[PDB]
Amino acid sequence: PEQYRYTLPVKAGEQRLLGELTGAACATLVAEIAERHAGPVVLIAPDMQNALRLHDEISQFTDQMVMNLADWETLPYDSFSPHQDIISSRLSTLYQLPTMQRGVLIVPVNTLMQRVCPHSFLHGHALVMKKGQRLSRDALRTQLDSAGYRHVDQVMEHGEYATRGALLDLFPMGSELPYRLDFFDDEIDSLRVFDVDSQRTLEEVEAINLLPAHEFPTDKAAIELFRSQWRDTFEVKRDPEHIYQQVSKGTLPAGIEYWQPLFFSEPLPPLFSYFPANTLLVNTGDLETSAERFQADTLARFENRGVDPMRPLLPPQSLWLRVDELFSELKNWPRVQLKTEHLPTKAANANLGFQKLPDLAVQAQQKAPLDALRKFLETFDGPVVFSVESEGRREALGELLARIKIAPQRIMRLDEASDRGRYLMIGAAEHGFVDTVRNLALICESDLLGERVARRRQDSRRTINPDTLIRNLAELHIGQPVVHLEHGVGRYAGMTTLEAGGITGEYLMLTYANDAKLYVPVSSLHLISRYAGGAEENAPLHKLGGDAWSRARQKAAEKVRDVAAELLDIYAQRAAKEGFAFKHDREQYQLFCDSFPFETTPDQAQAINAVLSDMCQPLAMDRLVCGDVGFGKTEVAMRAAFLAVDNHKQVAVLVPTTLLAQQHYDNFRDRFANWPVRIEMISRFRSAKEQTQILAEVAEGKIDILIGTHKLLQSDVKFKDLGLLIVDEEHRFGVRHKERIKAMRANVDILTLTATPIPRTLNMAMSGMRDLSIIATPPARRLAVKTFVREYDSMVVREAILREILRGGQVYYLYNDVENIQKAAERLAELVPEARIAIGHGQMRERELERVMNDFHHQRFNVLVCTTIIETGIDIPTANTIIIERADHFGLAQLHQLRGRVGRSHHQAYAWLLTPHPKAMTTDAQKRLEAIASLEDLGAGFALATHDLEIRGAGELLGEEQSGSMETIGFSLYMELLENAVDALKAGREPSLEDLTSQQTEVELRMPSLLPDDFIPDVNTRLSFYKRIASAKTENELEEIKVELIDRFGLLPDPARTLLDIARLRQQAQKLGIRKLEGNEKGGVIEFAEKNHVNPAWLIGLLQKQPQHYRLDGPTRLKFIQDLSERKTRIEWVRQFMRELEENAI
């Protein structure tokens, strides 16, 4: 009858406690408490941990606005400023808050106690701009400088704006995405949104709001104000590093935000000052415990960090509220309190009917795995609603529920749930609850399949193109190894501007041996490619004009053919031999899978089905799968074996080292735990006697799965019916054994595994030569990651850990490995009692892996001590600070590999490469470090190193012999020869298809052909376009590029149109022959190729009707005389002439 037990509070200090709630309970409650209340709802969260998890949950049960006031995520009086996306987010929220009419906003007690800027600030320093305002570009540019934005070239992050002639790109603080203006005679023409990666313009827009670029003014005034009030509060010092001194010179020190006060005359108000009048607060946990713990750490830091003579600190009063004022302010608003525990019948309380779901998990042991769920469903009256995270997970339920004759009906809003209905809604809800009050059931995947693991696979956000960076040499730094087809491997030296026949042209400088400097015409850039070899440190330095190259370029083609051959007949042969089909049985299979309740990656499943199929076809299988150590990469091998044993066939698994064997042994035992499958291992961990007693059981057919070292090769092991061979990391067994392997390979299906992945490109090539399935490592993204190189200093380690923990994240802690990893763990828990340490042993078993992953998803542990790089490979998304105790003994290879393990979009991630006393460090290592210490974010180098890696993988797949030519000419060209040698050996011809050499076309019209300095100032940016244009190949590729240019830099100069146009002629030139075409003021000279498409009837008819315009010169040239006095005329005619030439061709 009353819609509910509770009634909403309306007056200051009026609580309305609600009790006995469980899982997605609050979630759904805050959602309701938001729909019945004309006003806003500020949901104070006890810890940042909860809030972030809350935003996604509440969002499931409402079409309302679920918002979040972000926290600086820095440490009180930190040495780091907030990350932009955080400040942008805040400014957005504060700015809108007062006019907030409906919805939810989530604030951590942490953040709520922090003081905000005066609402005078935002309201006043705010501005707008529309489709046609009277603001000149160079004006706004100055305005932007006052607002405190930064002039940049590219404009990638919030708070920046860039200049490029007719255009203006800015990423305004209150917005989600950046804007590209474009002006017209002092009047702003249009406004366009644009992607920072693409840089292209997406949607068309008509308006833009412009908030400041900080939560505190930076204009001329502010700084004078800052100086004053400073002098008013602390002593001053000349020293160039004193905050005063710095803020004066127009510089913004790092921990500035904790000085916000001084940028204002007024005090900083209490966040509440922004809450609308009809705002309703909502609680969780007990704020007072939290609120006090913070006040304690704030004060704690106020004394310790308050010693730097260059950074005197402000009193905690100016920045934060007292636990008193917090509740003092808190008393002014009505506020529903949410509690889990049962409530005592006080009239102002409620006690919503919510209970913990039954025990519905799946049991792989029981002969009816899903009956708990089956009977619970045929024993319920009300609705069931099954919650799922992805539209790809919804699919998983179907496959699951189908086995109990249930195909749920989709809801959207919970209200659509009537009786006996079985519903399913897509949402972030972790796990269920029961609804006494209205008898409703909510079942999330976790309640049904153990417990999820926290990883999200979409990267689209910031994906760095493997191609781009390499195909277009996008971030080429002076000194990096470059490759010229004609000469070899040099080193980028920059770009210059020289003089030809009185026409300025641009050139790419490349140094070679003995500082021999080669100058490359921008128009010939197509003969250039970035060096690839997995070893950047070691790159050939060919001598310019030397013989070496031309040779190496051949030796390589030689080997590449041998390889393409050896493979091609071997694949062909195995394709003509009869093997063994394996049947399958979808049912038996599905049951095995029961013992693995986890979502498989798409790359992954692709592989499983791939491996399974090859097994079911009447031909011996011989696949290779290249993945990582992500939770579940073992599943392929697992399922492979399940299939061979379900067919009563023994399985052998070879591994390089015992530790691996053991690991493999373990994993197998735990995977087939619910099956009568006998498993055994032969390795150092077995005396001779036992080896004997085992091999014996093997011959008898009593062992379904044997696992062993090379010792499994040493002996002449007899199997009663071997059908599957699984070799892990074959590449590292060593000559003698490798042979013994290809020997134990015939007559049986084979499955080879390996970590090191392979390049996408080398994949399409192999198709038909080697069966391969690749489990790609998620793309490299451009993420905020500050890297530091410090000498071990515990106070750093400590603050470092702390800083992550206070934001609800975890920390990786790769260690030295001198002592006992168990002591290091203690030694660190002592240092940081606020934290809780876990350990991560090498060769983690899947079981260990999921335990650690889960514990971390439940904040159960917030620091993980590691011993190896591979361990740091674990998948934890909230681990965004990685510490490396003895970083010195690691190569860029690995650092980078480590550096990237941290990182979350819209948030700052850190990495502390720790070192020893300068005298214990190797001169080489020191320089190696300082190099990375120079990187400000995770961009190129990482994505590039990710590339190198895949190359070593390539080397491994093909051979130490191939890794050589790969290292000698550059993976780029190697694949060039290969892709060729293959297509060739396939069609039936021969590899000497050294056709690789270009038509050597040269189309010069004695006019400027280039991208002008003041059109595209960034040298490097230009360079990319050159290569792109040089390399373009169709007429459409050049237009696309043209469009990009105009859309990103506007009006196309003349040297530009030219560049492009000539580029197009040069093409037409090839399609038609023409090994050269010079043009000038007076006419020109076409130089044709032996094989051309010039119709003689046409030419001869041209020679006679127009004598004074065309004369032959030699059996190959054709001179032409015309009035090409003006640059625009010349080009026009030459194009027209090409047109006419091809329209008559033969």
**417: how many CB neighbours lie within 10 A of its CB?**
21
As given in the structure block, the two tokens for residue 777 are 């490592």
Q: What is the residue extent of each domain of the chain?
A: 14-125+215-352, 126-214, 353-451, 452-478+778-999, 479-537, 538-777, 1000-1146
* Distances 169 to 163, 218, 574, 1052 between C-alpha atoms, Å: 7, 21, 59, 17
Q: Is 93 annotated as a binding residue?
A: no
* Distances 651 to 585, 639, 681, 705 between C-alpha atoms, Å: 19, 12, 12, 5
- The method recorded for this entry reads X-ray
Please identify which residue in the block is written with the tokens 């995947």.
445
φ/ψ (deg, to 5) at 1099: -60, -50
Instruction: Kindly report the three-state secondary structure assignment for every residue of 234-245.
Output: CCCCCCCCCHHH
Report the DSSP pairing between strands 440-444 and 103-108: unpaired
Among 1041, 1020, 1031, 1099, smallest CA distance to 1066 is for 1031
Q: Is 633 annotated as a binding residue?
A: yes
DSSP state of 862: -
Kindly calculate the radius of gyration of the chain based on its CA atoms and give it in whole angstroms. Answer: 35
Name 913's Cβ contacts closer than 8 Å, sequence gap at least 6. 787, 788, 789, 790, 884, 887, 895, 929, 932, 933
Q: Is 1101 annotated as a binding residue?
A: no
Measure the CA dihedral 973/979/983/984, to 10°: 30
- How far, in Å, CA of 413 to CA of 426, rounded? 10
CATH topology of domain 538-777: Rossmann fold (3.40.50)
- How far, in Å, CA of 671 to CA of 762, rounded? 33
Please identify which residue in the block is written with the tokens 């309701």.
32
Name 91's Cβ contacts closer than 8 Å, sequence gap at least 6. 122, 173, 174, 211, 212, 215
- How far, in Å, CA of 199 to CA of 783, rounded? 17
Q: Are 591 and 364 in contact (CB under 8 A)?
A: yes
- How far, in Å, CA of 793 to CA of 827, rounded? 14
Q: Is 627 annotated as a binding residue?
A: yes
**Span 126-214 CATH architecture:** 2-Layer Sandwich (3.30)
Resolution in A: 3.2
14-125+215-352 in CATH: which number?
A: 3.40.50.11180
Name 45's Cβ contacts closer than 8 Å, sequence gap at least 6. 51, 54, 106, 107, 108, 109, 284
- How far, in Å, CA of 1043 to CA of 959, rounded? 44
479-537 maps to CATH 2.40.110.20? no
Orientation angle between helical segments 1019-1031 and 1054-1072, nearest 10 degrees: 20
DSSP state of 463: B
Q: Are 763 and 788 in contact (CB under 8 A)?
A: no
What single letter denotes the amino acid at residue 390?
Answer: S
Same fold, 353-451 and 452-478+778-999: yes
Please identify which residue in the block is written with the tokens 């749920």.
408
As given in the structure block, the two tokens for residue 522 are 């921008």
DSSP state of 1094: -
- How far, in Å, CA of 655 to CA of 184, rounded? 69
Judge residue 421's burial from the number of C-beta atoms within 10 Å of its C-beta, 0-12 exposed, 13-18 middle, 19 or more buried: middle
**Span 1000-1146 CATH architecture:** Alpha-Beta Complex (3.90)
Side by side, which strands form the sheet with 335-338?
66-68, 103-108, 40-45, 280-284, 335-338
DSSP string, 150-195: EEESS--STTEEEEETTEEEE--TT-SS-EE--EETTEE--EEEE-
Among 497, 489, 389, smallest CA distance to 448 is for 389
Among 279, 286, 300, smallest CA distance to 37 is for 279
- How far, in Å, CA of 180 to CA of 266, rounded? 36
As given in the structure block, the two tokens for residue 963 are 């890794």
Q: Is 628 annotated as a binding residue?
A: yes
Residues in the chain: 1146
Number of DSSP helices (H) and strands (E) in the chain, helices first:
37, 44
Q: Is 634 annotated as a binding residue?
A: yes
Q: Is 788 annotated as a binding residue?
A: no
Q: Are 761 and 466 in contact (CB under 8 A)?
A: no
Q: Are 325 and 292 in contact (CB under 8 A)?
A: no
Choosing among 3.30.565.10, 3.90.245.10, 3.20.20.70, 3.40.50.11140, the CATH entry for 353-451 is: 3.40.50.11140
- How far, in Å, CA of 424 to CA of 412, rounded? 8
Q: Are 230 and 262 in contact (CB under 8 A)?
A: yes
452-478+778-999 in CATH: which number?
A: 3.40.50.300
Q: Are 762 and 754 in contact (CB under 8 A)?
A: no
